[PDB]
Design a protein around this motif. Structure first.
Motif, PDB file in Angstrom:
ATOM      1  N   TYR A 145       0.826  -1.200   0.000  1.00  0.00           N
ATOM      2  CA  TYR A 145       0.000   0.000   0.000  1.00  0.00           C
ATOM      3  C   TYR A 145       0.863   1.253   0.000  1.00  0.00           C
ATOM      4  O   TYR A 145       0.558   2.226  -0.695  1.00  0.00           O
ATOM      5  CB  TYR A 145      -0.928  -0.015   1.213  1.00  0.00           C
ATOM      6  N   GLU A 146       1.935   1.251   0.789  1.00  0.00           N
ATOM      7  CA  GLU A 146       2.832   2.397   0.821  1.00  0.00           C
ATOM      8  C   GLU A 146       3.499   2.608  -0.526  1.00  0.00           C
ATOM      9  O   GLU A 146       3.663   3.748  -0.973  1.00  0.00           O
ATOM     10  CB  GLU A 146       3.883   2.204   1.907  1.00  0.00           C
ATOM     11  N   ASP A 147       3.907   1.524  -1.182  1.00  0.00           N
ATOM     12  CA  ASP A 147       4.486   1.658  -2.513  1.00  0.00           C
ATOM     13  C   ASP A 147       3.489   2.282  -3.476  1.00  0.00           C
ATOM     14  O   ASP A 147       3.836   3.188  -4.240  1.00  0.00           O
ATOM     15  CB  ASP A 147       4.942   0.296  -3.028  1.00  0.00           C
ATOM     16  N   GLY A 186       2.360   5.134  -7.007  1.00  0.00           N
ATOM     17  CA  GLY A 186       1.249   4.741  -7.841  1.00  0.00           C
ATOM     18  C   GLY A 186       1.344   3.337  -8.385  1.00  0.00           C
ATOM     19  O   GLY A 186       0.405   2.881  -9.047  1.00  0.00           O
ATOM     20  N   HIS A 187       2.448   2.637  -8.134  1.00  0.00           N
ATOM     21  CA  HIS A 187       2.621   1.260  -8.562  1.00  0.00           C
ATOM     22  C   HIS A 187       3.417   0.517  -7.503  1.00  0.00           C
ATOM     23  O   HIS A 187       4.150   1.116  -6.716  1.00  0.00           O
ATOM     24  CB  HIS A 187       3.339   1.169  -9.911  1.00  0.00           C
ATOM     25  N   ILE A 188       3.266  -0.807  -7.491  1.00  0.00           N
ATOM     26  CA  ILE A 188       4.043  -1.626  -6.573  1.00  0.00           C
ATOM     27  C   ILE A 188       5.517  -1.476  -6.910  1.00  0.00           C
ATOM     28  O   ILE A 188       5.928  -1.662  -8.062  1.00  0.00           O
ATOM     29  CB  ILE A 188       3.602  -3.093  -6.654  1.00  0.00           C
ATOM     30  N   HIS A 235      -5.447  -2.994  -7.947  1.00  0.00           N
ATOM     31  CA  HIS A 235      -4.091  -2.905  -8.486  1.00  0.00           C
ATOM     32  C   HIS A 235      -3.577  -4.319  -8.711  1.00  0.00           C
ATOM     33  O   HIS A 235      -2.724  -4.814  -7.967  1.00  0.00           O
ATOM     34  CB  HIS A 235      -3.171  -2.127  -7.547  1.00  0.00           C
ATOM     35  N   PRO A 236      -4.079  -4.998  -9.736  1.00  0.00           N
ATOM     36  CA  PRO A 236      -3.745  -6.411  -9.914  1.00  0.00           C
ATOM     37  C   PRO A 236      -2.274  -6.618 -10.232  1.00  0.00           C
ATOM     38  O   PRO A 236      -1.598  -5.745 -10.781  1.00  0.00           O
ATOM     39  CB  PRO A 236      -4.632  -6.839 -11.084  1.00  0.00           C
ATOM     40  N   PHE A 237      -1.786  -7.798  -9.869  1.00  0.00           N
ATOM     41  CA  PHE A 237      -0.405  -8.163 -10.145  1.00  0.00           C
ATOM     42  C   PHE A 237      -0.144  -8.155 -11.645  1.00  0.00           C
ATOM     43  O   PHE A 237      -0.930  -8.695 -12.428  1.00  0.00           O
ATOM     44  CB  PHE A 237      -0.120  -9.544  -9.558  1.00  0.00           C
ATOM     45  N   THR A 238       0.966  -7.538 -12.043  1.00  0.00           N
ATOM     46  CA  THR A 238       1.348  -7.472 -13.448  1.00  0.00           C
ATOM     47  C   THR A 238       2.770  -7.989 -13.624  1.00  0.00           C
ATOM     48  O   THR A 238       3.369  -8.493 -12.670  1.00  0.00           O
ATOM     49  CB  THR A 238       1.231  -6.043 -13.972  1.00  0.00           C
ATOM     50  N   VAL A 239       3.320  -7.878 -14.833  1.00  0.00           N
ATOM     51  CA  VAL A 239       4.653  -8.381 -15.141  1.00  0.00           C
ATOM     52  C   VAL A 239       5.388  -7.343 -15.977  1.00  0.00           C
ATOM     53  O   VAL A 239       4.811  -6.359 -16.440  1.00  0.00           O
ATOM     54  CB  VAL A 239       4.613  -9.733 -15.881  1.00  0.00           C
ATOM     55  N   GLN A 240       6.683  -7.577 -16.166  1.00  0.00           N
ATOM     56  CA  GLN A 240       7.499  -6.675 -16.963  1.00  0.00           C
ATOM     57  C   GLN A 240       7.049  -6.685 -18.417  1.00  0.00           C
ATOM     58  O   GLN A 240       6.638  -7.719 -18.951  1.00  0.00           O
ATOM     59  CB  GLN A 240       8.970  -7.072 -16.875  1.00  0.00           C
TER      60      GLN A 240
END
Ligand SMILES: [Zn+2]
Ligand SMILES: [Zn+2]
Ligand SMILES: [Zn+2]
Ligand SMILES: [Zn+2]
Lengths: 275, 353, 248, 192, 142, 353, 276
Positions: free
Chosen positions: G156-158, G163-165, G228-233
């Motif tokens: 959450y802090e990130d 604005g992103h993890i 904020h779903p998990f994403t990838v590079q």
């Protein structure tokens, strides 16, 4: 004639130390920072005292180096030999015959006279260091003269033991303004610092601090009315000279537990014995 | 009835003679040369030069020989020797871009302009005790390749040109010299770097390890490690122009650290710097990591771990001071201990029922 | 039945220091204050009741369940989901490196909120509830004032709607104006949320303003059960008179 | 007198461990430990597991039916493990279908702060097929596995109910002849 | 021979320098057919100290230790555990341990080999102690 | 178009050849033997044996030679070799009371039974570089005295007999071995001492120095420094009795520390202990000081400085682990840095389109 | 094996201890099992835990594949592979399908793993909470009580700060729905490959003395928020060699002018794609 500059220190280092000494004398009790160098002795083995002596010693001076009050102590012997090599000055074991005295943890029993200089070797040149380890904080404490924490620690010691736990390096107020710690000398020696006729120099090479007490200055040990300043006491006299007014040290003779108490100040012991 | 005899100097002399005889060891073995130490114990010599302050290989080897191999004692010998010598000149700022590389590795890119020049290194060696070294043999002949050094730009130049990092600007500030005046906290980054370079390898390594284990992380990447020869130049008073006086073998480590997001510009990587003599990388790496850690006040970071505490880190970094003070306890302290015994004996007697 | 029953709780880590033979009960929605000298050991009582210090002897019964009979996991969950603790020093109850929004929403996330928008909205709502400006939600505790830090601590503890909050003299070190305004906010929250509050203070003014029922402890034991404006204005037992007169 | 052990201790130990790892990582899969040609009567699989895992650091408890003197001497000589008398002290508990409920409950299940400190139960069953049908799901099983071992009632209760919640529990190693089967503490078992 | 005397010659052999022991045995030219039941093996002995000098035990590192065993034709077993890494020295010490257990060799070796080795070690110790005592600090007399 | 090629294996082969050639140095100078190193660099060998875990001088010197004099690399070499060897036996507890003294000093009393034996030491030497060591010298002739060893009891035995200190009583507790199991904080004093013994000399020295400077004051006195040969004994299975296997040169340090006032009992001094291989005292003194600092939980002392933090002190004390993880940053890390670059580029694109 | 060392260089006692640790870890997916690691020839930080794990599991008939950064030819990879050829003599392959035991550092092979395959990870920091709570005394209890609130707080802090993890590798993952585990510092591009994989996964921290595992077909879910779903590079460029858009690319700086090329991190996958 040792191949080094007289007193082993280059001229600019001597000038810097001398300016520090003058500033310290002008501000009795204040720890004057000075850019000390690394001496042949290791840090903590008396480099500050060595540097001060090198800065003040001259050809005509008579030097007396004592450790634990004894001239023949290993560290005293090493320092005296170093100074003999790099200066060739005359050395003495008699307090009254010495113009400059370098001492590690004692003030000689023999009273000092005018024109004498006594150099003290200080491991920790800060009475508040064991209370507040930060130099950034103790510096401002000294600047504002906020020494209440020292009183707090003394009261805590009284509460825990009924007595001031401190027994050497006992803090003292100089000229009514600065709390400084003297060398790690016993409480026994603190009274000798008050209104002394000899200039007192304290040097901490590792901590790089020089401070001083001019002759005839008020040096009052911190205490309370309910707990007056006491001094180390023994029920025995010196086993050699029989003196009852000297700081005694304990010598264990055998594992059975036999021990003898002898004057720490060997020169004073010799003087008393020859009398 | 006892009498005080005078037996300090003779004991000191006997002890020193014993130490010298022990240093010489068995007389059947030939006394090892200072040149032998300088050539074949080169990593110890590198550490001694770095922490002693003199970049003279022969002097460091001599200090090692005189100290019987004790790194602390040799470092102190070299530091004490520094005092006697006079400062003839101050070198012009080193230009590490002109380094004649013997080793260049970047951990942030697979390949870089100039390549990954491993150079001499113990890395990727299986640390198995080689018992063939008990009896001297012969080193194998070195294979060769093209004898040209293609351009080797700094990796942070590449990152900064991309905008991912910031160039280190020279504002003309006069460097602080702790050797001239005692340190005063807080310390400028120049004084901090000077103190770190003189700091003990083990202590700085432990602090960097603590930062890497979460005690105030800085998220380090080995941006680039360079070891090579840097030319030294001075501008004498009697000549109006710079003169090249020689070259020093130095190791430079530049670390990419966690990026920040300044309020009024794009986020960028923070960086740390380490520079040592010789080819001892780990000292430079620890220097860079602790340098970044001590940059906390500049970035307004809270000091989480001890490695971020500037006074604690730098007051105990100096190997010479630390060793000397820890060793001072071997000196007689029977006056202070007699005072303590007096106090204790009274406290015991007060509560004796 | 009373929400926090204390029966003969005793603990004396050092001779005299601590508390002994302490017994009382607490009902929902009533503020119980504790007043005593610094050496009274009231603070040790507060730790003991607030599932932090194990008593040497006695029994706590939260709801109808012995407090210390609960497993470590159960009481750990209780201290973060239904109970609240407001330390005197905000940095003790606040995560310093975490922004104010994160500090407030940590309880929600520990429950498994798993939605950034909802968590942030709730954090903003609670920041409004305690008068803190919502513009500085992303700020961090060290950049707040003492009163603001206290307000943030109460918001953090109240985010979960705790039914019982202990408060170890949170007003200490605050100015009279700030202290009064904070106490007014606390009154508003206490009345608006039917949650019991156990407030420990070293002064009678705060207890007067906040507490509903009052207890007085001397040298580690209960002196006399009290009540607002009765013990304050009609101190029966002599030490009570001594305390009130010392304040006066 | 002393029973023999692996002919090639290193290779045989490695092979047996790989088979046991296959069994444990994929619950419900039956594997054969064929490296040892004769178990220390009373089977081959149990002997292989003890020889490949047990050592001086792992106390071993043998149930009374299996607590023979010759096997005790063989374990002392080969594995060097200490043979304890109470199941509470056993890192490896070896028993048969006669295990009692109290003995099963006495085994160490570890602590929530160190679940690996528990004990591993090696149960010898009459057969690995023919008993009450059981459905296994969880880690190690793609969709579901159907196994019908012939094992006691107390073990069925332990598996189906799991009185000790995860991570606490005991990993079960059913053995029969040279064939082996493993049910970790993280496997959800349900009668048919 | 009681365990005290066996401990004594085993200690004497262990402390002896490998070179001098080898020279002594070659000079003695003693014939004794034997088989090495356990070939000289080098490993570690875990050094165990007492905190405070007399308190609780704690492990204080390790030291290299070479152990060997020998069986004579008659059947006597000799063992040696010598600190160091010299396998030949360990085998020689084990052989001498085996020999000392035979009355045919005990009396001869105890005076021709063991006693001279102990005397030489004691002489070395005395010389070293004499040169070390020169560094003692003197403070008082009589 | 580019095509990948294999160059890792040949690159590392060339790098190791270069390192070996550099270690050999100038072929004109004879290759210094292991005997010369273990004789004339004895103080380096002492640290290597202590921190590497093996008390064999020849092995430590061989590691130093193979490591180009690098203390960290040599320590890691010796520690790795430790894994190969088997534990043949566990010695009976060492009895320091029966060591053949080569050095015995006490700072608490002016004179003690058995005298102050300075022995071979560098103390009281003026650390001036001895340039005469640049050329072969002549072996000094050692003066002699009486060869008898005076009874030398431990100073703490004398203090305890007076009741000032508390005897270290053995409860029969089994020592904790960290080589067999990983440490589990909070650690018992036996495992703490074991870890401190194999800890970094520099790190421990810095922590002890910090304690002396106020960060966790303990008021230390060098009660007894005592270096000499201790006989090592074992109890094999083949023979039921105890056999003496040899002797080790050990240095034992015992510090007197600030006295406490336990309830009921009279006040007494607290103590710290340290024990190392070889003649290097400073490591033993640092070990004793840090041990006393870590004894804080037993005395209920509030941790004022990091030296009193068991987790922090013991987690970062090991040379091999610390050095390994700082130097790991030199390994390729371009996948992780690529991830960081992807994120940072996204952030920069967002803030400044 | 003719090097004079015991097969796999480890004494049977240490191999037995590591095997017991491996079995306990497999029985408790996601839990860091303490084990008495020893000092290998390779320094701590350089993959000693994975080395010990593979030494404990590797056998005569296994086919070993060592990859560092996804490349077989990486210096550390070739060093470890040479060590294992010396002390084991097993066959080594650069093809993922042929390998029976895969020791990987910071990457998971692009080619999906089949059953009976073991992938061993080298993790420097086995504790996902280490950088939030540096003290083991605290994180051990936090794992015991399943108090993973601080992880979500850090995420959450990130999000609030950037604005992103801000975690891009070593992304924490809840395995089997109970234990939050720190995978090797693999890019978050690789976490999806860990879910319901048919192969056993072993993670070993030699320096930190920890072993943990994920059995085949286990639920591994990367922590994230619903909004904020998990994403990838992501990369705009395909591989500069094989032209593949489904592989983790790495950046190669050709010259100081700024010319760069992106190439597949998984060298074996790139080779397989190019030859097609
Ligand atoms: Zn001192
Ligand atoms: Zn006298
Ligand atoms: Zn890494
Ligand atoms: Zn590709």
């Amino acid at each position: 004639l040792s191949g080094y500059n007289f007193a082993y220190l280059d001229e600019q280092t001597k000038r810097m130390i001398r300016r520090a000494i003058l500033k310290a004398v002008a501000i009795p009790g204040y720890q004057v920072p000075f850019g000390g160098r690394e001496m042949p002795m290791p840090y903590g083995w008396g480099t500050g005292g060595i540097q001060l002596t090198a800065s003040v010693i001259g050809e005509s001076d008579v030097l007396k180096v004592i450790d634990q009050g004894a001239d023949d102590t290993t560290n005293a012997v090493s320092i005296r030999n170093f100074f003999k090599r790099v200066t060739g000055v005359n050395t003495t074991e008699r307090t009254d015959d010495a113009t400059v005295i370098q001492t590690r943890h004692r003030i000689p029993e023999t009273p000092l006279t005018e024109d004498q200089i006594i150099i003290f070797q200080v491991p920790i040149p800060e009475p508040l260091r064991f209370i507040e380890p930060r130099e950034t904080e103790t510096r401002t404490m000294h600047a504002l003269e906020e020494y209440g924490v020292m009183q707090v620690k003394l009261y805590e010691d009284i509460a825990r033991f009924g007595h001031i736990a401190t027994t050497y390096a006992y803090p003292v107020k100089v000229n009514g303004r600065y709390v400084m710690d003297p060398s790690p000398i016993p409480k026994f020696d603190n009274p000798k610092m008050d209104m002394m006729p000899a200039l007192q120099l304290f040097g901490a090479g590792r901590e790089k601090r020089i401070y001083a007490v001019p002759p005839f200055t008020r040096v009052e040990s911190l205490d309370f009315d309910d707990h007056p300043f006491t001094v180390q006491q023994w029920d025995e006299p010196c086993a050699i000279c029989g003196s009852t007014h000297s700081y005694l040290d304990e010598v264990v003779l055998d594992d059975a537990g036999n021990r003898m108490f002898v004057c720490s100040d060997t020169d004073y012991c010799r003087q008393q014995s020859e009398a | 009835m006892y009498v005080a005899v005078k037996g300090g100097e003779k004991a000191i002399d006997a002890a020193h003679a014993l130490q010298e005889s022990r240093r010489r060891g068995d007389t059947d073995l030939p006394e090892l040369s200072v040149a032998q130490i300088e050539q074949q114990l080169n990593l110890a010599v590198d550490r001694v030069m770095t922490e002693g302050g003199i970049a003279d290989r022969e002097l460091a080897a001599l200090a090692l020989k005189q100290a019987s191999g004790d790194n602390v004692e040799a470092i102190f010998l070299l530091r004490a020797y520094r005092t006697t010598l006079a400062k003839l000149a101050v070198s012009e700022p080193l230009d590490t871009t002109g380094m004649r590389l013997e080793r260049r590795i970047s951990a942030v890119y697979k390949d870089i302009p100039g390549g990954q020049l491993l150079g001499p290194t113990y890395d990727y060696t299986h640390r198995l005790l080689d018992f063939t070294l008990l009896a001297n043999g012969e080193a194998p002949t070195l294979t060769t390749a093209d004898s040209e050094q293609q351009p080797s730009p700094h990796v942070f130049s590449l990152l900064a040109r991309q905008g991912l990092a910031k160039f280190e600007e020279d504002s003309g500030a006069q460097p602080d010299d702790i050797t001239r005046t005692p340190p005063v906290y807080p310390c400028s980054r120049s004084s901090r770097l000077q103190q770190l370079m003189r700091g003990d390898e083990g202590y700085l390594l432990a602090l960097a390890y603590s930062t890497q284990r979460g005690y105030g992380r800085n998220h380090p990447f080995a941006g680039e490690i360079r070891s090579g020869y840097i030319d030294v130049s001075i501008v004498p008073e009697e000549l109006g122009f710079a003169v090249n006086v020689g070259e020093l073998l130095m190791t430079e480590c530049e670390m990419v650290n966690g990026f920040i997001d300044p309020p009024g510009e794009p986020p960028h990587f923070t960086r740390g710097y380490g520079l040592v003599f010789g080819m001892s990388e780990r000292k430079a790496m620890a220097m860079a990591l602790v340098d970044r850690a001590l940059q906390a006040p500049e970035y307004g970071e809270h000091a989480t771990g001890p490695a971020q505490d500037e006074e604690f880190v730098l007051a105990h970094a100096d190997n010479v001071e630390v060793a000397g003070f820890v060793s001072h306890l071997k000196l007689p302290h029977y006056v202070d201990f007699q005072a303590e015994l007096e106090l204790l004996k009274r406290l015991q007697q007060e509560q004796n029922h | 039945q009373p929400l926090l029953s204390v029966n003969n709780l005793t603990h004396l880590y050092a001779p005299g220091k601590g508390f002994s033979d302490v017994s009382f009960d607490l009902w929902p929605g009533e503020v119980l204050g504790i007043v005593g000298e610094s050496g009274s050991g009231k603070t040790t009582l507060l730790k003991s009741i607030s599932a932090r210090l194990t008593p040497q002897q006695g029994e706590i019964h939260y709801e109808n369940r012995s407090l210390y009979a609960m497993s470590e996991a159960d009481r750990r969950r209780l201290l973060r989901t239904e109970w609240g603790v407001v330390h005197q020093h905000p940095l003790d109850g606040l995560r310093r490196q975490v922004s104010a929004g994160g500090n407030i929403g940590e309880r929600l996330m520990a429950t498994g909120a798993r939605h950034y928008g909802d968590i942030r909205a709730t954090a903003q709502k609670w920041l409004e509830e305690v008068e803190i400006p919502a513009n500085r939600i992303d700020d961090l505790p060290t950049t707040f004032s003492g009163g603001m830090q206290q307000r943030l601590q109460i918001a953090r503890n109240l985010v979960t709607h705790p039914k019982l909050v202990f408060m170890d003299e949170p007003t200490g070190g605050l100015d009279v104006s700030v202290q009064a305004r904070l106490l007014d906010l606390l009154r508003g929250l206490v009345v608006e949320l039917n949650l019991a509050v156990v407030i420990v203070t070293h002064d009678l003014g705060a207890a007067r303003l906040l507490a509903d029922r009052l207890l007085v402890m001397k040298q580690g034991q209960v002196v006399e059960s009290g009540l607002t404006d009765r013990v304050l204005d009609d101190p029966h037992h002599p030490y009570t008179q001594l305390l009130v007169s010392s304040v006066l | 007198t002393l029973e023999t052990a692996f002919m090639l201790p290193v290779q045989d130990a490695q092979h047996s461990f790989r088979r046991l790892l296959k069994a444990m990582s994929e619950p419900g899969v039956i594997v054969a430990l064929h490296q040892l040609k004769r178990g220390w009567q009373p089977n081959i699989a149990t002997t292989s597991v003890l020889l490949t895992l047990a050592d001086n650091d792992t106390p071993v408890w043998l149930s009374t039916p299996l607590n023979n003197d010759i096997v005790n001497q063989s374990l002392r000589f080969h594995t060097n493990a200490p043979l304890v008398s109470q199941p509470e002290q056993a890192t490896f508990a070896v028993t048969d279908e006669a295990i009692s409920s109290e003995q099963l409950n006495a085994l160490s299940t570890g602590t929530a702060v160190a679940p690996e400190a528990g004990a591993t139960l090696i149960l010898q069953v009459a057969s690995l097929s023919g008993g009450r049908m059981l459905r296994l799901t969880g880690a190690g099983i793609a969709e579901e596995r159907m196994i019908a071992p012939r094992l006691p009632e107390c073990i069925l209760h332990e598996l189906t109910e799991r009185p000790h919640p995860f991570p606490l529990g005991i990993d079960l190693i059913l053995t029969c002849g040279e064939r082996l089967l493993a049910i970790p503490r993280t496997t959800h078992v349900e009668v048919c | 021979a009681d365990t005290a005397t066996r401990q004594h010659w085993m200690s004497v052999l262990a402390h002896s320098q490998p070179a001098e022991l080898a020279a002594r045995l070659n000079a003695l030219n003693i014939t004794a057919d034997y088989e090495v039941i356990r070939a000289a093996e080098t490993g570690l002995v875990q050094i165990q100290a007492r905190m405070g000098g007399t308190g609780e035990r704690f492990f204080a590192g390790d030291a290299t230790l070479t152990r060997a065993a020998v069986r004579l034709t008659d059947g006597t077993l000799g063992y040696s555990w010598v600190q160091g890494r010299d396998k030949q020295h360990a085998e020689r010490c084990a052989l001498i341990d085996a020999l000392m257990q035979q009355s045919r060799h005990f009396q001869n070796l105890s005076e021709t080999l063991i006693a001279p080795l102990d005397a030489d070690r004691m002489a070395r110790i005395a010389a070293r102690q004499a040169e070390v005592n020169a560094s003692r600090v003197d403070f008082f007399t009589m």
